[PDB]
Amino acid sequence: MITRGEFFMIKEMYERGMSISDIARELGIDRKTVRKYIHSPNPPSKSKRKQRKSKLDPFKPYL
DNA sequence: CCTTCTGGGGAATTTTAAACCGGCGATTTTGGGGAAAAAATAATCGGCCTTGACAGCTGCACAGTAAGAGAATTATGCAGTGCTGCCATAACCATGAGTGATAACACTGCGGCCAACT
């Protein structure tokens, strides 16, 4: 979940010719994570989750 | 008057410094698996801050359009009646097939009789 700026920085510094491992060191990210993000379309910073059960569900129709 | 010393130059050789390229040893990095920790997200909890309402109640008036409710009128479909013709059914006889009936034995249902308890 590296933010827009983090992903932009990773992609740019990698494409400039800078080595990937020291890129990860500089940005404080795991080498596997950085390498995976190298070949990625756009910055991933969103997680989608659907609704979940609550306590007032059985009573909701009655209310 | 003569001899010896020295110096310059061209060629041959040697050594050391520098740079490249290859080989060898070390660390790094990538990938996968397992555990631990952090953070993010959602849900649930308590509580503070702020304000609306409760103060008789709302039914009516006008505007225009549309609908509808009741009564009178009209159209139409059903019904009723008479006369004639055609189709259906019914009546009889014959023959075949199905079912209700009859005999016999076995099992079960109902009515008459005896006994036990209150």
Curated annotation (Swiss-Prot):
The entry's protein name is: Putative transposase for insertion sequence element IS5376
Q: What are the boundaries of the region Disordered?
A: 35-55
Known DNA-binding region:
20-39
Organism of origin is: Geobacillus stearothermophilus (Bacillus stearothermophilus)
**Residue limits of the HTH IS21-type domain?**
5-63
Functional summary from the UniProt entry: Involved in the transposition of the insertion sequence.
Q: Which family does it belong to?
A: Belongs to the transposase IS21/IS408/IS1162 family.
* Top-level taxon of origin: Bacteria
